Amino acid sequence: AAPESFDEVYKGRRIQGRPAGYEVFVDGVQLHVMRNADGSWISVVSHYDPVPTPRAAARAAVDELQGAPLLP
Amino acid sequence: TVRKNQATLTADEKRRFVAAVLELKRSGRYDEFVRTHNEFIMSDTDSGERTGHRSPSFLPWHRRFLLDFEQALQSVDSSVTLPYWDWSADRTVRASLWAPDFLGGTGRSTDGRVMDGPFAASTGNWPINVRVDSRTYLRRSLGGSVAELPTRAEVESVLAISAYDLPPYNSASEGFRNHLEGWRGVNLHNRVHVWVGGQMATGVSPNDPVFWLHHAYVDKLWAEWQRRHPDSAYVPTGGTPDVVDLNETMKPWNTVRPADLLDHTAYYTFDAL
Ligand SMILES: [Cu+2]
Ligand SMILES: [Cu+2]
Ligand SMILES: [Cu+2]
């Protein structure tokens, strides 16, 4: 069962997530994310720090980026 | 070749190591290591094929990866070897490791930019090319995202685990490999990546030279583990889908198997084990 989709503005940036097995976008740019066996998630900008959900991963990315544009 | 504790390097050894690293960077060979690691970290998954991470081959894979790097370093200065960072011992931002004559320190609060050392962006010698965002400068936030680095006691508890790995051979597994990797338990290897912060916490972690020192120690811990458990060996040993079995070959090389990398002494030794 894939997680639900989401869409919101976090720290002035638009983050979106949707089932594909799941895609995340930061200001329209896709963010590589992965699901762990235990159900937690990680993104390419925090690949050793599991967070509970895809939205948590997108928010972690925005946090890490500090305003910087994601590279495709 | 002998891999020594970074804390014990002479001023000249630090000089030659830094110079060799900077040359690999200038020549463009360095960035390829960064790319290789990112590509694998992005493809290794718990549900499918996994070679470099969250799998029994995490250890032999990074062992071979580090050997490739050390060999490249030696092609520049034959006297250079990969030092290791014992983060259980040198756990403060004050360790000699983070001095301007070695790796430089933590990044500034505004943007995490490292401002000193030979890899600071301002030197013009360390452009971040292989990246996931627009920032082209080395970034660090020592102890920012995670309070503490593993302690010796915590490391000991992991070294005590007798089983190398256990089914399902992924991030949910029990056993030595996964606890050392950090997905389960007190968390060793993963927490260190998080502690450094910056590029070290991302898929393109090799962008930070400390990446090699961190993994050289994780690699040493595997050697210490084998010493503690001579009756335990690499698993699985045959016919396991998506996972690299003992006698199967590993990507990207294809010409080497975990069985060929179990004994590190065939390639190097440590100042002390
Ligand atoms: Cu890695
Ligand atoms: Cu990934
Ligand atoms: Cu790692």
d(CA B160, CA B94): 30
Query: With 0-12 CB in 10 A as exposed, 13-18 as middle and 19+ as buried, what is B7?
Result: middle
Q: How far is CA B101 from the centre of its chain?
A: 21
- Bridge partner residues of A41 (DSSP): A35, A51
Sheet holding A41-43, edge to edge: A33-35, A41-43, A46-51
Counting Cβ atoms within 10 Å, is residue B13 exposed (0-12), middle (13-18) or buried (19+)?
A: middle
- For this PDB entry, the determination method is X-ray
Q: Do B133 and A69 touch (CB under 8 A)?
A: yes
Instruction: Give contacts of B38 with chain A, Cβ < 8 Å.
Output: 44
A vs B, Cβ pairs < 8 A, gives 72
| Domain range summary for chain A, segments of one domain joined by + | 5-66
Q: From B183, B182, B177, B209, select the one nearest B196 (Cα to Cα).
A: B209
Dump the DSSP string for chain B. -EE-BGGG--HHHHHHHHHHHHHHHHTTHHHHHHHHHHHHHHH--SSS-BSSSSSTTHHHHHHHHHHHHHHHHHHH-TT----B--TTTS-STTSGGGSTTTT--PBPTTT-BB-SSTTSGGGSS----S-SBS--S-B--TTTSSS-PPPHHHHHHHHT---S--TT-STT--SHHHHHHTSSTT-SHHHHHHHH-GGGGSTTGGGSTHHHHHHHHHHHHHHHHHHH-TT---S--S--TTB--TTSPPTTT-S--HHHHS-GGGT-EES--
| Ligand 3: centre distance to CA B193 (Å) | 7
C-alpha to C-alpha distances, B225 to A34, B36, B133, B163, B185, nearest whole angstrom: 30, 27, 38, 10, 17
With both helix axes pointing from N to C terminus, report the angle between B29-43 and B11-26 in degrees, rounded to the nearest 10: 80
Looking at domain B1-273, its CATH class is: mainly alpha
- State the Cα–Cα distance between residues A26 and A10, nearest whole angstrom: 10
Strand partners, A25: A16, A30
Is the Cβ pair A68, B134 closer than 8 Å? Answer: yes
Phi-psi region of A15 (alpha: psi -120 to 50; beta: other; left: phi over 0): beta
Q: How far apart are CA A20 and CA A16, in angstroms?
A: 12
Q: Which residues surround ligand 2, an ion (CB under 5 A)?
A: A 34; B 42
Cβ within 8 Å of residue B266, ≥6 positions away:
none
For residue B194, give the nearest of A44, A48, A65 by CB distance: A48
Spatial CA neighbour of B141 closest among B180, B89, B198: B198
* Alpha carbon of residue B191 to chain centroid: 12
Measured in whole angstroms, the distance separating CA B42 from the mean position of its chain's CA atoms is 16
**Which residue is associated with the tokens 């960035």?**
B31
Mutate which: A44, A47, A65, vs B, most B CBs within 10 A: A47
Contacts of B180 (CB under 8 A, 6+ apart): B59, B158, B188, B189, B218, B221, B222, B225
Contact A24, A33 (CB under 8 A): yes
Q: Which ligand is nearest to the CA of B53?
A: 1
Q: Please indicate whether, in this complex, the C-beta atoms of B172 and A38 are within 8 angstroms of each other.
A: yes
Handedness of CA B11, B17, B19, B22 (dihedral sign): negative
Any idea where the domains of chain B sit in the sequence? 1-273
Check if CATH label 3.30.70.120 holds for domain A5-66: no
Cα B208 from Cα A43, distance rounded (Å): 19
B203 lies within 8 A of chain A by CB: yes
CA distance A46 to chain B (A): 5
Q: What is the residue type of A64?
A: E
What is d(CA A44, CA A48) in angstroms, rounded to the nearest whole number? 9
- Phi/psi at A13 (nearest 5 deg)? -120, 145
Distance, in Å, from the CA atom of B234 to the CA atom of B165, rounded to the nearest integer, reads: 8
Contact between B260 and B61 (Cβ < 8 Å): no
**Ligand closest to the CA atom of residue A31:** 2
Whole-number Å distance between alpha carbons of B93 and B85: 13
CA A22 – CA B243 distance, rounded (Å): 23
What's the reported resolution, in angstroms, to a tenth?
A: 1.7
**H or E element that contains A65:** helix A54-65
Residues of A in contact with B111 (CB under 8 A): 66
Category of B182 on φ-ψ map: left (φ > 0), alpha (ψ -120 to 50) or beta: left
Residues 1-30 on A with a CB inside 8 Å of B are: none
Q: Are B77 and B140 in contact (CB under 8 A)?
A: no
